[PDB]
Design a protein around this ligand. Structure first.
Ligand SMILES: *[C@@H]1O[C@H](CO)[C@@H](O[C@@H]2O[C@H](CO)[C@@H](O[C@@H]3O[C@H](CO[C@@H]4O[C@H](CO[C@@H]5O[C@H](CO)[C@@H](O)[C@H](O)[C@@H]5O)[C@@H](O)[C@H](O[C@@H]5O[C@H](CO)[C@@H](O)[C@H](O)[C@@H]5O)[C@@H]4O)[C@@H](O)[C@H](O[C@@H]4O[C@H](CO)[C@@H](O)[C@H](O)[C@@H]4O)[C@@H]3O)[C@H](O)[C@H]2NC(C)=O)[C@H](O)[C@H]1NC(C)=O
Ligand SMILES: *[C@@H]1O[C@H](CO)[C@@H](O[C@@H]2O[C@H](CO)[C@@H](O[C@@H]3O[C@H](CO)[C@@H](O)[C@H](O)[C@@H]3O)[C@H](O)[C@H]2NC(C)=O)[C@H](O)[C@H]1NC(C)=O
Ligand SMILES: *[C@@H]1O[C@H](CO)[C@@H](O[C@@H]2O[C@H](CO)[C@@H](O[C@@H]3O[C@H](CO)[C@@H](O)[C@H](O)[C@@H]3O)[C@H](O)[C@H]2NC(C)=O)[C@H](O)[C@H]1NC(C)=O
Ligand SMILES: *[C@@H]1O[C@H](CO)[C@@H](O[C@@H]2O[C@H](CO)[C@@H](O[C@@H]3O[C@H](CO)[C@@H](O)[C@H](O)[C@@H]3O)[C@H](O)[C@H]2NC(C)=O)[C@H](O)[C@H]1NC(C)=O
Ligand SMILES: *[C@@H]1O[C@H](CO)[C@@H](O[C@@H]2O[C@H](CO)[C@@H](O)[C@H](O)[C@H]2NC(C)=O)[C@H](O)[C@H]1NC(C)=O
Ligand code: NAG
Ligand code: NAG
Lengths: 50, 48, 149, 97, 489, 723, 198
């Protein structure tokens, strides 16, 4: 057993971000090309701000 | 939150509880599943 | 959002960064055979456990990295719990900035006789244990930025 | 709460004395009156005994009753009463409870 | 070979030392032999038999017999009852009159309070450090066994045992037949008497909790000798030549004894088994008796009943032997041997390791079902005031396969109410899981889960004992003692 | 008759990678019989080598014309292979020492390193040392009595670590340890050693004459009580003294005209100190130093031609002896009617005569009461004397008693002995390593024992039960008896046959034949506490007249145990006692931790035994656990005092009443052979050591140099003072 | 070192779709890539619900040899795709190693065929083996100082690194550079291969 190690992302010196697709109110819950373009723009803004 | 305890040889890589949703269109389900030292499985689900 | 503190991977950390006297520890726990020791092992005030199940650490570039290890035995649970503490020796790796002063150095942790023979056989295959190499980079890492209050 | 921890024995035998059913299970029926149930500790001797009840009621131990629905949980406590006369534990619950 | 290997202890006979006794010796008034042990000063002990020996050591060296110095006319020096009061004093009943003996000194004192001849001295000794139960260990009863309650006189003392005063007979007016003893049942914080109306007998309680109340009657062939367990948990052992009973309660229920043989239990009747028990040794949790036909029986006394097994054979009975619990899991057979060349007695001892003893394949006992039971409440004693609650904790780790059922109980439920939660946290490196149980204790009335017939007042102080135990613990669990503590409201 | 040797003294190294040299001596020899797992080189030779990789026990027997016994040897897999080698040098100007350390493998080392005569590491040792520096292994030295560590510098051109070390003479015991870096699945064992000032053996002037034992008598040997490998040995032809384990020796002789030729061949006993040597020549005491050979007389407080014996301490209580700050007796002599306590500088007063002891023991006077042997027990400030009592004589039977004398209290006590022995038998007694006096004594035909506070008193007997050792050794008398810290007692015969005893064990073990009947041999100790046999024979080239060979007593005992069938009742016993002397003041307590691990329910516990004038209280907390079919019992005990000195009278009197020293020992409940555990015995003293005091900051004795001062202060006192 | 965690999205692929609502369906995910790196390790793993699916790692990093013609379709600046993966090519050949930097190589190159001047250049870890025919002439040096006597158009020792790519035909080292913007500049975008070290 290996225990009490530091958790990886704060000791191996990495930087993390999250980006989740927006909630779509469609009954099927499927996206479209338009909303994925919106998602791509949002993840671009996240990377830019990073 | 649930705890799962094996009594025999346990599947370490594959989690042993598969969860299924009857209607995914009205509910949002976020799941976390972690392992213990003796393969005790801690799972927790948030439903909205 | 940007992930400060979360619930990431378990297991061994991949690599390491160090800067001027900081350190880290790994605590290892071994469970031995049911009858790994006999009454003939009672030879001194403390049980000698190195003859059967011992843990060793080897360092490279030894004049810049120090390692201190210490065991403890609980024979009721057939366990040996040990702490390995690795510290910087405050020399080498000349003064620099951000991405220059770093020198790479791989330390090895192992338990004697384990490598090759033992294996954790799980569902879907088996993984090799008893011998793990961790790399550290001495110098100074990214992330440490200075600002004006 | 370990679900498959292992249950193999029925330590209690309870009855409401209104409708008798199979002694292997405890089925109770609720009507307008107070639900009145007499219960005893079933052991190797299946008859009620004043010895085991007196042993239990000496350490401040009294039975407890958990009723559950799909959305409801409730607990009811058997009263601590001296064992000088009784043989089985008794409890009566108002319907509005 | 098995069980014990004998060992003889004798000192003081190195050279020609002229040591002689002076006075009339002391002898017991019963065929059986006994060893009375002090509670916490366990080194001091009294062996009562054909000769009486008071040892300050744990029966080491050579001991001269106890002697009356003839300065006071004791008549026939027969001892009927002995007791250990707090301090360096021991009380004896010689020829119906009470006497005090100091063993650090050589002081004899005559008890002047008693007038009518008594036969037995009774009392309870708590020796927790402090000043609380030092006063509790001062109330003592003096009574004559086998007498008629209408007419006989019974004395008590609250100043230890200095002066004895007869109590009024108004309280005992309505009890008819023969008394078997009066006890300060501090587990109930009550006063109880044993009463023999007929061939069967019962128990009576004085104080307002269960006043004028009764226990389940039990047979009373011949007389009985009554032995308390020294932890104030109310465990009672009543033995004589041809019977033995165990009261798990404080006399409310007195039941028989089980016997384990080939994984089946049977009730043990001494007369029907055609045996005669010779010696009885009682620990805080354990019990053992030597049957005069060279037999030894050991039992663990607990709730739900007592299981008694027969130890392997060894010729131990030698007309003078006495068993006593040297320690938990350690029995000791002691036999004094005379020596007229130096006019002194040496001793022969067998140290019986019962834990090592109960592994014979002919017995085949199932091992312990619990791996660890540890708490920190056994060291001290706890007090409660009103509108105040307290909490205690314990940790238990069970065996790999079995499923033991723990249970916590209170000696006196009338003035002590509990709520215990047992939650699982963590697990050991093997895989066995630690369980932590915490109990919350307060007064019984504040819970509100008792009748007015059961609450029994709130304005008066009382005393009880809290015990955590395993309900389905098997035998061979000698060292894993259940946890017990003393708590005064 | 055959035997075997191994390359290393330390038996922890012994594993499958080692080699065993098998040597058979005898006219008739055929071959060797081995199991299939192990291999012998040149199986038809009486001298050969044995290599074996599979672990377990192996039965080896040399098949020959006569009957040769077989031997079972245990080989176990070990991860400790390498060993430390160190070489010291002493400088006096700085009053320090310098040590050079390197790593050597016993299987592939040089010959000189195997006998501790090397000054430069060999090629394999140097390459392995630089490999250990490369992988990163660094030794360091740790003093035992006071926990101080000393570190080396960098490796030199050759493989050598150089460490400087203060000259202490109070903490003479040290260890050397290393990091946990291993090479190729092999470790390096820690090494224990002792060092103090280098002492000088005497030189020989020309024209001197040897001092010998009487002809036909056995050869004697005596060593220093604290540091071994410094001893003096007397034979029928010469007296030798060694600064080492008799690797190099120097003769000891006498100036002409001091003693007669007949007197020079009547030397009875010898004792060695750092200052000089003491000879008992025909009942007269002679002191030999590097300067003179002076005969002790009445001017120093001794009698002439009346001394029958003398003795010294046997356990190195050097810390307490140094910290006592009071010079005490270092020797005790007895003259059958009077004992003398010899202090330093070899002058003394009479201790006790027999008349005072006769008055003490309430004897009816005019009785034959004699003193015959005095020993220093483990407690530093008392002694014990064997008293022989006639009991109105007219028979051959004499009562044997013991009397103890306490120097701190200047009192006497009589203990419980009931031994009856004839007039002819002479007695020699020793104290075992215990807080409680346990006595092993022998009378050149039997060995009797007193254990467990003089209660278990009896005769050590054979498993057959003869109780006489001469019959099992063809009618010969007891020569040497050696004890140790562990508790194994070794009885050597003049036939050179072997008996083994364990402390608190009645049955003895006859060892297998290892050494010839006619060989002139002695048993001694190496730098460690292992058994060595020294062979002396004249008519040689002066370089092999004294040859030392180690003895595998543990392996022979193991073979005997596989023959018999015994086992240790407990798996393990641990304790936290890391010292022998513990000193604390009023406001501190002492905490001791211990633990036993044993089978499922064989009910055991830890026995704590005490000795002295008890002034302390104990608190004990016990924990019990069962796991994997094994029981673990953990004990934590605390020793403390609970007295108050506020608002009391006779404060100094109470302070003296609540002071002294205590002896404690820890042991299992029941134990037998094959239990190699060391019983922890220690001492606890209360009071001040007179080495702790109080300084104001900024002040010092002589950092500020100044001169003499004089002044007058008047009219301000509580008339004219000149100070 | 930076990492981005995203959840995929559901996408009804457009077509005739005779069914009403559920149809051909494929998860889609955005694709960011920052300035200053080429090596992108993508990790795909299940949400936690649904059928079990394993965890995988892929590398779609920075294929940067790509030029656009007038018609607007992909073209390799090193060579042209003109051959067929015939099983005959390496049915008896030995095993040939694969050389690149320790982790930072955004491409992979492997040749060592029988006689054909072809490599197996591919992104990822040869998950998608796209063959290539190099537009490099087949040259052989001359004499005296030199000898190498057998062209054998089989790029031996085909190595690469970030940006540059090195091949060795018979005594001829040729060096190429892919265009890799946001790493250094537009500058060393090679027109084609160069015989270097004259
Ligand atoms: C009862 O048992 C007793 C115990 O054995 C018997 O005592 C024995 O008596 C013998 C004679 O009475 C002694 O034998 C003599 O030993 C001399 C020692 O010389 C040196 O010996 C060492 C080691 O000796 C052997 O080595 C082998 C090596 O494999 C071992 O296996 C073996 O066990 C034994 O130990 C040699 O190594 C020496 O050689 C060199 O030594 C140098 C160190 O100085 C070293 O640097 C170098 O590299 C060499 O190794 C020596 O040889 C022998 O010398 C004697 O031989 C004689 O020597 C002289 C002078 O050299 C010659 O002039 C002469 O011709 C003859 O060769 C002789 O062999 C034996 O030592 C002794 N046992 C012990 C333990 O001391 C007793 O006799 C028995 N009684 C009965 C009745 O049986
Ligand atoms: C006490 O005095 C002695 C006197 O000999 C000291 O020993 C000497 O120590 C010095 C300082 O280290 C040595 O000088 C140099 O040492 C280095 C060590 O790396 C060496 O590389 C150099 O070549 C040079 O020798 C000196 O050699 C040494 N003396 C001898 C004879 O070796 C000792 O250090 C003093 N101890 C203390 C605590 O002051
Ligand atoms: C080990 O055995 C010896 C030998 O018996 C023990 O010494 C004994 O100690 C006791 C108690 O100190 C002595 O008793 C004394 O009795 C007189 C009256 O007879 C009393 O006045 C004294 O105050 C004291 O109590 C006893 O004489 C003494 N025996 C001898 C021979 O001196 C010792 O205590 C034992 N050790 C242990 C740890 O048990
Ligand atoms: C490599 O790093 C450069 C420098 O950050 C990145 O180029 C810059 O990207 C930002 C956002 O993508 C551009 O900002 C945009 O500018 C236009 C025109 O002014 C404006 O309409 C937008 O609203 C937005 O603000 C910026 O102009 C651009 N700078 C240059 C010199 O091109 C580049 O994106 C990085 N490489 C990659 C692959 O991301
Ligand atoms: C103590 O008082 C309680 C009061 O509830 C007694 O309970 C009786 O129970 C029986 C049967 O349930 C009822 O018929 C009675 O009416 C109850 N008594 C009252 C006063 O209501 C209980 O029996 C009493 N116990 C003792 C020993 O006196
Ligand atoms: C029923 O509810 C009432 C009102 O709270 C309560 O007083 C009574 O005790 C309850 N009955 C039981 C059996 O708990
Ligand atoms: C005694 O008990 C009776 C009923 O059993 C009760 O009425 C009375 O109050 C009690 N008296 C005391 C003093 O407890």
């Amino acid at each position: 057993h290996l225990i009490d190690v530091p958790k990886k992302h704060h000791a191996s010196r990495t930087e993390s971000y999250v980006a989740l697709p927006p909630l779509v109110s469609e009954s099927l819950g499927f996206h479209n090309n338009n909303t994925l373009a919106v998602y791509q723009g949002l993840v671009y803004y996240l990377l830019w701000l990073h | 939150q649930f705890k799962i305890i094996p009594k025999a040889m346990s599947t370490f890589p594959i989690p042993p509880v598969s969860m299924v949703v009857g209607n995914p269109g009205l509910v949002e389900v976020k799941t976390q599943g972690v392992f213990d030292l003796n393969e005790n499985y801690y799972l927790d689900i948030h439903v909205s | 959002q940007k992930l400060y503190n979360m619930s990431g991977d378990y297991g061994i950390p991949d690599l390491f960064f160090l800067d001027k006297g900081n350190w880290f520890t790994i605590t290892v726990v071994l469970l031995s055979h049911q009858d790994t020791f006999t009454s003939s092992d009672s030879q001194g005030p403390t049980i000698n456990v190195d003859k059967k199940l011992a843990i060793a650490v080897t360092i490279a570039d030894p004049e810049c990295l120090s390692v201190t290890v210490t065991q403890d035995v609980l024979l009721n649970r057939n366990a040996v719990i040990n702490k390995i503490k690795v510290i910087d020796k405050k020399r080498c790796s000349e003064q620099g900035m951000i991405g220059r002063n770093i020198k790479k150095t791989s330390m090895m942790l192992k338990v004697l006789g384990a490598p090759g023979n033992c294996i954790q056989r799980t569902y879907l295959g088996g993984i090799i244990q008893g011998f793990k190499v961790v790399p550290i980079f001495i110098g100074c890492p990214p992330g440490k930025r200075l600002a004006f209050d | 709460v370990i679900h498959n921890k292992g249950k193999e024995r029925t330590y209690f035998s309870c009855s409401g004395e209104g409708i008798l059913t199979g002694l292997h299970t405890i089925k109770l029926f609720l009507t307008m009156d107070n639900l009145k149930v007499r219960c005893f500790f079933r052991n190797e001797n299946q008859s009620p005994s004043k010895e085991i009840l007196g042993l239990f009621t000496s350490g401040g131990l009294a039975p407890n009753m958990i009723i559950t629905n799909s959305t409801f949980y409730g607990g009811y406590y058997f009263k601590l009463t001296p064992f000088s006369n009784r043989l089985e534990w008794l409890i009566d619950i108002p319907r509005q409870n | 070979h098995t069980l014990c290997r004998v060992h003889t202890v004798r000192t003081g006979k190195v050279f020609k030392s002229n040591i002689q006794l002076q006075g009339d010796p002391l002898f017991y008034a019963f065929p059986n032999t006994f060893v009375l042990k002090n509670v916490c000063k366990a080194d001091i002990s009294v062996y009562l038999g054909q000769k009486v020996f008071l040892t300050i050591d744990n029966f080491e060296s050579s001991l001269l017999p106890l002697t009356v110095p003839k300065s006071l006319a004791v008549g026939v020096p027969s001892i009927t009852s002995a007791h250990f009061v707090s301090g360096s004093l021991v009380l004896f009943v010689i020829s119906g009159k009470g006497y005090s003996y100091d063993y650090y000194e050589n002081t004899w004192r005559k008890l002047e309070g008693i007038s009518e001849p008594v036969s037995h001295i009774s009392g309870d000794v708590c020796c927790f450090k402090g000043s609380f139960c030092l006063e509790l260990s001062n109330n003592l009863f003096a009574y004559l066994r086998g007498g008629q309650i209408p007419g006989t006189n019974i004395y008590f003392s609250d100043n230890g045992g200095f002066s004895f005063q007869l109590m009024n007979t108004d309280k005992l007016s309505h009890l008819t037949g023969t008394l078997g003893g009066i006890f300060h049942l501090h587990s109930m914080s009550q006063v109880g008497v044993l009463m023999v109306e007929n061939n069967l007998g019962t128990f009576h309680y004085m104080e307002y909790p269960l006043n004028h109340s009764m226990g389940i009657a039990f047979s009373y062939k011949n007389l009985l000798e009554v032995i308390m367990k020294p932890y104030q948990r109310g465990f009672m052992v009543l033995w004589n030549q041809k019977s033995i009973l165990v009261s798990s309660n404080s006399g409310q229920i007195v039941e028989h004894v089980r016997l384990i043989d080939q994984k089946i239990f049977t009730d043990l009747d001494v007369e029907h088994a055609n045996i005669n028990i010779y010696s009885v040794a009682s620990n805080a949790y354990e019990l053992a008796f030597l049957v005069a036909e060279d037999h030894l029986y050991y039992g663990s006394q607990s709730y739900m009943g007592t299981y008694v097994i027969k130890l392997p054979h060894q010729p131990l009975w030698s007309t003078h032997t006495s068993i006593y619990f040297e320690d938990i899991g350690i029995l000791q057979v002691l036999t004094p041997v005379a020596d007229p060349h130096f006019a002194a007695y040496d001793f022969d001892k067998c140290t019986v390791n019962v834990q090592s003893s109960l592994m014979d394949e002919k017995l085949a006992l199932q091992p312990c079902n619990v791996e660890l039971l540890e708490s920190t409440m056994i060291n001290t004693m706890f007090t409660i005031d009103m509108n105040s609650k307290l909490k205690l904790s314990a940790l238990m780790i069970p065996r790999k396969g079995e499923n033991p059922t723990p249970l916590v109980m209170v000696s006196n439920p009338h003035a002590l109410g509990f709520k215990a939660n047992l939650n699982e946290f963590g697990n050991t490196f093997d895989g066995n899981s630690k369980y932590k149980l915490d109990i919350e204790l307060k007064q019984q009335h504040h819970w509100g889960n008792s009748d007015f017939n059961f609450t029994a007042s709130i304005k008066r102080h009382a005393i009880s004992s809290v015990t955590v135990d395993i309900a389905d613990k098997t035998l061979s669990c000698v060292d894993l003692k259940p946890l017990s503590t003393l708590i005064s409201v | 008759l055959w035997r075997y040797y191994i390359n290393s003294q330390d038996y922890s190294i012994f594993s499958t990678r080692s080699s065993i040299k098998l040597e058979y001596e005898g006219n008739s020899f055929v071959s060797w019989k081995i199991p299939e797992s192990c291999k012998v080189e040149n199986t038809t030779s009486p001298k050969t080598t044995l290599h074996c990789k599979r672990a377990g026990i192996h039965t080896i027997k040399p098949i020959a014309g006569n009957q040769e016994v077989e031997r079972h040897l245990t080989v176990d897999n070990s991860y400790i292979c390498y060993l430390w080698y160190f070489t010291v040098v002493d400088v006096y100007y700085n009053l320090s020492q310098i040590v050079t350390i390197w790593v050597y493998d016993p299987e592939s080392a040089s010959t000189e390193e195997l006998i501790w005569t090397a000054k430069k590491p060999s090629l394999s040792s140097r390459v392995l040392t630089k490999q250990m520096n490369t992988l990163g292994q660094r030794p360091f030295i740790f003093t035992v009595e006071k926990r101080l560590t000393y570190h080396p510098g960098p490796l030199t051109s050759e493989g050598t670590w150089v460490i400087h070390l203060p000259m202490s003479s109070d903490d003479i015991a040290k260890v050397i340890r290393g990091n946990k870096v291993a090479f190729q699945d092999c470790f390096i064992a820690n090494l224990y050693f002792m060092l103090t000032y280098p002492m000088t053996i005497i030189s020989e002037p020309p024209g001197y004459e040897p001092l010998t034992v009487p002809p036909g008598s056995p050869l004697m040997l005596s060593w220093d009580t604290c540091i071994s490998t410094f001893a003096l040995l007397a034979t029928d032809q010469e007296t030798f003294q060694t600064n080492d384990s008799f690797q190099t020796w120097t003769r000891v002789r006498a100036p002409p005209g001091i003693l007669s030729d007949a007197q020079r061949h009547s030397l009875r006993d010898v004792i060695i100190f750092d200052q000089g040597t003491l000879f008992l020549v025909d009942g007269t005491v002679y002191l030999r130093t590097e300067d003179e050979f002076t005969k002790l007389d009445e001017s120093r407080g001794i009698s002439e031609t009346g001394i029958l014996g003398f003795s010294k301490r046997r356990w190195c209580q050097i810390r307490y002896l140094y910290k006592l700050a009071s010079k005490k007796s270092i020797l005790i002599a007895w003259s059958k009617t009077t004992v003398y306590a010899g202090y330093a500088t070899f002058r003394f007063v009479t201790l006790t005569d027999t008349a005072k002891l006769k008055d003490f023991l309430k004897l009816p006077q005019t009785d034959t009461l004699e003193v015959m042997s005095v020993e220093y027990l483990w407690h530093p400030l008392e002694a014990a004397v064997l008293l022989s009592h006639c009991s109105v004589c007219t028979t051959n039977t004499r009562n044997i008693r013991i009397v103890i004398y306490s120097a701190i209290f200047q009192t006497w006590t009589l203990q419980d002995f009931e031994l009856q022995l004839p007039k002819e038998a002479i007695l020699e007694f020793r104290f075992l390593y215990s807080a409680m006096p346990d006595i092993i004594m022998w009378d050149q035909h039997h060995v009797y024992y007193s254990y467990k506070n003089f209660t278990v008193v009896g005769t050590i007997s054979t498993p057959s039960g003869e109780t006489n050792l001469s019959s099992l050794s063809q009618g010969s008398k007891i020569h040497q008896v050696l004890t140790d810290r562990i508790g194994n007692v070794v009885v050597k015969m003049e036939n050179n046959v072997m008996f083994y005893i364990k402390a608190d064990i009645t049955e003895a073990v006859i060892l297998h034949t290892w050494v010839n009947t006619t060989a002139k041999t002695v048993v001694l100790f190496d730098k460690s506490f292992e058994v060595c046999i020294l062979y002396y024979n004249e008519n040689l080239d002066e370089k092999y007249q004294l040859q030392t060979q180690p003895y595998p007593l543990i392996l022979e005992l193991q073979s005997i145990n596989k023959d018999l069938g015994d086992w240790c009742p407990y798996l393990a016993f641990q304790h936290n006692i890391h010292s022998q002397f513990y000193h604390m003041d009023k406001g501190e307590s002492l905490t001791i931790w211990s633990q036993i691990v044993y089978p499922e329910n064989r009910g055991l516990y830890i026995v704590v035994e005490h000795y002295g004038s008890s002034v302390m209280t104990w608190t004990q907390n016990l924990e019990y656990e069962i796991a994997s079919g094994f029981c673990t019992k953990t004990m934590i005990t605390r020793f403390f005092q609970t007295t108050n000195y506020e608002l009391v009278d006779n404060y100094y009197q109470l302070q003296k009443e609540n002071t002294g020293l205590m002896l404690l020992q820890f042991r299992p409940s029941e134990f037998s052979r094959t239990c190699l555990t060391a019983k922890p015995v220690f001492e606890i003293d209360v009071g001040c050591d007179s080495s702790k005091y109080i300084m104001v900051r900024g002040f010092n004795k002589s950092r500020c140099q100044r001169r003499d001062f004089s002044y007058v202060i008047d009219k301000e006192l509580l008339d004219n003072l000149k100070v | 070192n930076v990492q981005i965690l995203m959840e995929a999205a559901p996408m009804r692929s457009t077509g005739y779709c005779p069914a009403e609502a559920m149809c051909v369906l494929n998860w889609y995910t955005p694709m960011p890539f920052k300035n200053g790196s080429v090596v992108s390790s993508v990790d795909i793993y299940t949400n936690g619900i649904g059928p079990f699916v394993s965890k995988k790692r892929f590398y779609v990093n920075m294929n940067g040899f790509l030029k656009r013609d007038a018609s607007g379709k992909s073209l390799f600046a090193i060579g042209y795709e003109s051959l067929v993966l015939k099983s005959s090519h390496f049915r008896l050949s030995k095993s040939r190693p694969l050389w690149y930097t320790v982790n930072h190589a955004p491409v992979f190159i492997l040749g060592g065929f029988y006689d054909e001047k072809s490599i197996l250049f591919s992104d990822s870890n040869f998950q998608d083996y796209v063959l290539l025919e190099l537009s490099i002439d087949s040259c052989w040096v001359g004499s005296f100082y030199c000898p190498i006597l057998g062209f054998s158009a089989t790029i031996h020792d085909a190595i690469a690194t970030e940006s540059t790519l090195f091949i060795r035909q018979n005594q001829l080292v040729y060096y190429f550079t892919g265009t890799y913007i946001t790493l250094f500049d537009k500058s060393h975008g090679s027109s084609r291969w160069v015989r270097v070290l004259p």
